[PDB]
C-alpha cells in the first residue's frame, strides 16, 4: 500500500507525536499489520382499549331478536 | 480384569440408562466372559444385592466394588502408597448409580494422566491447602481431555461438595482411582 518511504513513516505508524515521550527509532514505525431464538417486536405498543371498529354487542350474535327492533322492527347487523 | 467387557456387554441390553437388567441375564453372561463362578456366591450376589426389590441386579454398585476403591483399608504397613494428601473432606456423599457410571467412564483416562494432573491441580490456586474451586477443577479436567457433561458434573459435585461451598478437594477425588 506504500509506494513511498514517506507513506511508510506516515499513516500506518501508530506513534502519536503529542503523547509519545521519548520513543526510539524501532517503535515510531510500528505498524497495524504487525499486530438463539430470534424475536421481532412491534415498536408501537398499542392497547386493547385503543381498537378502532364497531361497538360490540352486549347480547350474543344469535339472540338479537327481542332488543334490536329498528323502530318498526327489522334485524340489525 | 474384564471390566470393559462386562460394561460394554451390559449397557447394550440396558433398556433405558438407569434401568438395570434381571438375574439370569447376569448369571448366564458371567459365563460369556468366563468369570469364576459358584452357586453359593451367586445366591447372595444376586438376591442380597438387588437393592430396589426387583429382579434386576445393580451392575454399577458391584463393579464399583470390583474396580474403584472409594474405601481404603490401609493395606497393612510396609506397603507404598500413592495419594498422600487426603482426608480433607467433611463426610459428603449421595452415591447414585449415575455417579458410579460417570466415575467408570472417566476411569481409563485418570490412571493414564494423574502424575501431571495433580501438579496442575497444585499450581492452580493451592498455596498449600488442598482445596480448589469448582470452576478451576473443571478447567484442569478439560486440559487433559476429561470432558464432563452437565449431568455428569452434577453427580460428581453432589458427592464432593455437599454444603454448596464451591470448594472441592482434589486428592480425595483422585483417591478413588488408584
Amino acid at each position: 500500500e506504500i509506494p513511498k518511504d514517506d507513506l511508510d513513516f506516515r499513516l500506518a505508524a501508530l506513534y502519536n507525536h503529542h503523547t509519545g515521550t521519548f520513543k526510539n527509532k524501532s517503535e515510531i514505525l510500528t505498524h497495524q499489520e504487525t499486530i438463539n431464538i430470534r424475536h421481532w417486536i412491534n415498536p408501537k405498543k398499542e392497547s386493547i382499549h385503543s381498537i378502532q371498529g364497531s361497538i360490540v354487542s352486549p347480547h350474543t350474535a344469535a339472540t338479537n331478536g327481542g332488543y334490536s327492533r329498528k323502530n318498526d322492527g327489522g334485524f340489525f347487523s | 480384569g474384564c471390566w470393559r467387557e462386562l460394561l460394554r456387554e451390559c449397557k447394550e441390553r440396558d433398556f433405558n440408562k438407569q434401568g438395570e437388567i434381571p438375574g439370569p441375564e447376569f448369571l448366564a453372561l458371567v459365563e460369556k466372559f468366563n468369570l469364576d463362578i459358584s452357586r453359593d456366591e451367586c445366591q447372595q450376589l444376586l438376591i442380597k444385592y438387588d437393592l430396589k426389590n426387583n429382579g434386576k441386579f445393580a451392575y454399577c454398585s458391584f463393579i464399583q466394588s470390583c474396580v474403584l476403591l472409594l474405601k481404603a483399608k490401609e493395606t497393612s504397613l510396609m506397603q507404598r502408597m500413592k495419594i498422600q494428601n487426603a482426608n480433607k473432606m467433611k463426610e459428603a456423599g449421595a452415591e447414585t448409580c449415575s455417579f458410579y457410571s460417570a466415575l467408570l467412564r472417566i476411569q481409563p483416562k485418570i490412571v493414564h494422566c494423574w502424575r501431571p494432573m495433580r501438579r496442575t491441580f497444585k499450581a492452580y490456586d493451592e498455596g498449600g491447602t488442598g482445596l480448589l474451586s469448582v470452576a478451576d477443577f473443571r478447567k484442569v479436567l478439560r486440559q487433559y481431555s476429561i470432558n464432563l457433561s452437565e449431568e455428569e458434573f452434577f453427580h460428581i459435585l453432589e458427592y464432593y461438595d455437599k454444603t454448596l461451598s464451591s470448594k472441592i478437594s482434589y486428592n480425595d477425588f483422585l483417591r478413588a482411582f488408584l
Partner: protein, 609 residues
C-alpha cells in the same frame, strides 16, 4: 380402534404459583398443564400424565418422601373444588377430597406425610386439615382474620403440627394443630407498622426462620418461635415487581426471584445481589433439584430454565405459549416446520426436536388465525384489532398492513395459490377478498351474506371457489372469476370448520351438535350425518391428499382418525382435555398435530386407515 403413539407434548402452564416442582429422587420434573399434570425425565419420554379433576388445575404440592403428589382444581361459583391425592409407584387417583368452594390456592404436606392442609377460596376463605392415612376431614376454621383481608399460600415446618398461612392482605398467622381436641390454634404475628401483601413463601431447613416475598420488593425475615419480625429486607435497590418465587438453601442463603425476571442469590442480615441473572418473564417457581447444585425456574410466560449454582449459567430447555392457541398452518411440501398463533405471539416451531425458531409479537392482542402463501414469502395473520398483518418468514419484518379490514377483528383467513388473492372474514359477517400487489394492497370486493362471525374459509386447488362457514348456520360457496354466491348450506348447527374433499365432489362440516355431516357441492343436500363425541362438540377438521384419511378434533381429549367411506374410528386421543379448537395433518402423511384452548400442542403419529 387401536391407539397410536403420542410423540411429544410441548405445553407448560407457568401461570400458577409454585407450579414447577422437582421430586426428590432426582430424575423427574412435575409441572401442571391445562387439565393434567406432566412428568418429564432426562430422556425425552413423557411418563403417563395424570388424568383427573374434570377442569383446570390451580395448584400443586408434593411430599418429601416422594410417594404422594397433591393437586387442586378450579370449579364454578358455588361448587366443590376437589383435591386429588396421587401415588407415584402406580400413578392413579388415590382419593377425592372435596371441601372447598371455588378454587384451591395452595396445598402442603408435612415432612413425613400424614397431614394435608388446603387454603382455598378467594370468596370462601377457609382451611381444612386432612389426613392421608384416613381420607376424612379433621378440623377447620375461617383462616383469614376479620378486618384484614384474604390469604394466599401455606407452608409446613418440621414438627408435623405447625403450619403457617400467607398474608393475602396483611394476615400472617402461624398455626398449631391439636390432635385430641380436634382443633387448630391461630396465632397472629405482630408487625410494627408494615402492612404488606405477600404472595411467595419459604421456610428454612431447621425451622429457625421463615421468609416472606412481599409485593413492595422487600423480603421479610420472621421467627416462628417468638412469632415476631426478625429482619427487614433491602432498603436500597429493592426488587422491582412482587417476589413470586423464593427458595432457601442448606446455609443461610436464599434464592429470591422477582416478577421482572430477576433471579437473585441473596443473604440473610443485609440483602445484597451476590449473583443475579436476568430471565424472560416473571419468575413464578423455584425448586431445588437434589441439594442445590442445579435447580429449576418457572416463568410467567412458559419458559423452564436449568441454571447451575456455580457462576450462574442458565439453559433454556422448554418454550411454549401462555394462552389459547389456534390455527396451525403447515408449509407446502416440507413437513419439518410448522407455525402457530395465540395471544400476543406468533411462533414457528421445528417439528422434529419440538423447539422454537422465531417469535413475532404484537403486544396486547390475540391472533384469530394465520395462513401461509404458496411459496414462503409471507405469513398473513388475522388479528383482533381489525387489522391484517404480514410478516417475513424469518426476522419477522412487517411487510405491510391492512388497516380497517373489518368492523371487528378478522376471524378467518385463506390464501389462493397464485399469491394474488387473500380471502378474509370478520366478526361483523363480511367476507372480503383482497388484492396483493408488489407495491399496493387493494380491496376488489366485499361479499355480503353472513349474519355472524366467519369461522373458517377454504378454497379449492384451482383458485376458483371458496366455502365460508359462519356461526349463524350458513355455509356459502363463492366463486372467483365473478364474486357471487352459488348455493346455501343451512343446518341447525353453529358451524366451526369446513373441509374440501379431494376430487371436489363432497363437502364436510362440523359444529357444536357433534355431527359430522357430508354435503354435496351443488344442490346443498345432506348425504349422511355422523357422530362426533356424544358429550361435547366438534371443532377441528382436516383431510389428507389421498382423500380417505380424515381427522376430527372434538371438544374433549380425543382425536379421532375416521374412515371417509364408512363411519370407522381409530381412537388415538388419550391426551389433553383442553378444548381442541383447530387441527391439521402433515403434508407428507407423517404427523397429526392438534391445538388446545390452553397453552398446549399435541403431536401424534400417522396411522393408515
Amino acid at each position: 380402534a387401536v391407539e397410536l403413539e403420542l410423540e411429544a407434548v410441548i405445553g407448560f402452564n407457568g401461570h400458577v404459583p409454585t407450579g414447577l416442582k422437582c421430586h426428590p429422587d432426582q430424575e423427574h420434573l412435575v409441572y401442571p398443564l391445562g387439565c393434567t399434570i406432566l412428568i418429564q425425565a432426562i430422556n425425552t419420554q413423557e411418563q403417563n400424565f395424570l388424568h383427573g379433576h374434570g377442569n383446570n388445575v390451580s395448584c400443586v404440592a408434593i411430599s418429601k418422601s416422594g410417594l404422594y403428589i397433591a393437586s387442586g382444581q378450579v370449579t364454578f361459583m358455588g361448587f366443590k373444588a376437589d383435591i386429588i391425592l396421587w401415588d407415584y409407584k402406580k400413578r392413579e387417583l388415590m382419593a377425592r377430597l372435596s371441601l372447598h368452594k371455588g378454587k384451591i390456592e395452595a396445598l402442603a404436606f408435612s415432612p413425613n406425610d400424614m397431614y394435608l392442609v388446603s387454603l382455598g377460596g378467594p370468596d370462601d376463605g377457609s382451611v381444612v386439615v386432612w389426613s392421608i392415612a384416613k381420607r376424612e376431614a379433621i378440623c377447620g376454621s375461617p383462616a383469614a382474620g376479620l378486618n384484614v383481608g384474604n390469604a394466599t399460600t401455606v407452608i409446613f415446618s418440621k414438627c408435623r403440627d405447625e403450619m403457617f398461612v400467607t398474608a393475602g392482605n396483611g394476615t400472617i398467622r402461624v398455626w398449631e394443630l391439636d390432635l385430641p381436641n380436634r382443633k387448630i390454634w391461630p396465632t397472629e404475628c405482630q408487625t410494627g407498622q408494615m402492612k404488606r401483601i405477600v404472595m411467595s413463601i419459604s421456610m428454612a431447613n431447621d425451622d429457625s426462620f421463615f421468609y416472606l416475598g412481599t409485593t413492595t420488593g422487600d423480603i421479610l425475615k420472621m421467627n416462628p418461635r417468638t412469632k415476631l419480625l426478625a429482619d427487614t429486607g433491602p432498603a436500597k435497590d429493592k426488587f422491582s415487581l412482587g417476589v413470586s418465587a423464593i427458595c432457601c438453601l442448606k446455609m443461610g442463603g436464599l434464592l429470591v426471584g422477582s416478577g421482572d425476571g430477576l433471579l437473585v442469590f441473596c443473604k440473610s442480615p443485609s440483602y445484597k445481589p451476590i449473583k443475579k441473572i436476568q430471565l424472560q418473564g416473571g419468575i413464578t417457581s423455584i425448586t431445588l433439584r437434589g441439594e442445590g447444585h442445579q435447580f429449576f425456574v418457572g416463568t410467567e410466560e412458559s419458559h423452564i430454565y436449568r441454571v447451575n449454582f456455580t457462576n450462574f449459567k442458565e439453559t433454556l430447555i422448554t418454550t411454549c405459549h401462555f394462552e389459547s392457541v389456534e390455527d396451525i398452518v403447515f408449509p407446502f411440501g416440507t413437513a419439518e416446520l410448522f407455525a402457530t398463533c395465540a395471544k400476543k405471539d406468533i411462533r414457528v416451531w421445528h417439528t422434529l426436536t419440538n423447539r422454537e425458531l422465531l417469535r413475532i409479537t404484537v403486544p396486547n392482542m390475540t391472533c384469530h388465525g394465520i395462513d401461509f402463501m404458496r411459496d414462503g414469502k409471507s405469513i398473513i395473520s388475522a388479528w383482533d384489532d381489525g387489522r391484517i398483518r404480514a410478516f417475513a418468514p424469518e426476522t419477522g419484518r412487517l411487510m405491510y398492513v391492512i388497516n380497517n379490514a373489518h368492523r371487528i377483528g378478522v376471524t378467518a383467513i385463506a390464501t389462493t395459490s397464485d399469491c394474488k388473492r387473500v380471502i378474509s372474514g370478520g366478526g361483523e359477517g363480511e367476507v372480503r377478498v383482497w388484492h396483493i400487489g408488489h407495491q399496493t394492497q387493494k380491496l376488489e370486493e366485499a361479499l355480503k351474506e353472513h349474519k355472524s362471525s366467519v369461522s373458517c374459509i377454504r378454497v379449492k386447488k384451482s383458485n376458483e371457489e371458496c366455502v365460508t362457514a359462519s356461526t349463524d348456520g350458513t355455509c356459502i360457496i363463492w366463486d372467483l372469476v365473478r364474486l357471487r354466491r352459488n348455493q346455501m348450506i343451512l343446518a341447525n348447527t353453529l358451524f366451526q370448520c369446513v373441509c374440501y374433499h379431494p376430487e371436489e365432489f363432497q363437502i364436510i362440516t362440523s359444529g357444536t351438535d357433534r355431527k359430522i355431516a357430508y354435503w354435496e357441492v351443488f344442490d346443498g343436500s345432506v348425504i349422511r350425518e355422523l357422530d362426533g363425541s356424544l358429550s361435547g362438540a366438534v371443532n377441528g377438521m382436516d383431510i389428507t391428499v389421498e382423500g380417505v384419511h380424515f381427522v376430527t378434533g372434538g371438544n374433549d381429549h380425543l382425536v379421532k382418525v375416521w374412515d371417509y367411506n364408512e363411519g370407522e374410528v381409530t381412537h388415538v386421543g388419550v391426551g389433553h382435555s383442553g378444548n381442541i379448537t383447530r387441527i391439521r395433518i402433515s403434508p407428507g402423511n407423517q404427523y397429526i398435530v392438534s391445538v388446545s384452548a390452553d397453552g398446549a400442542i399435541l403431536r401424534w403419529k400417522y396411522p393408515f386407515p
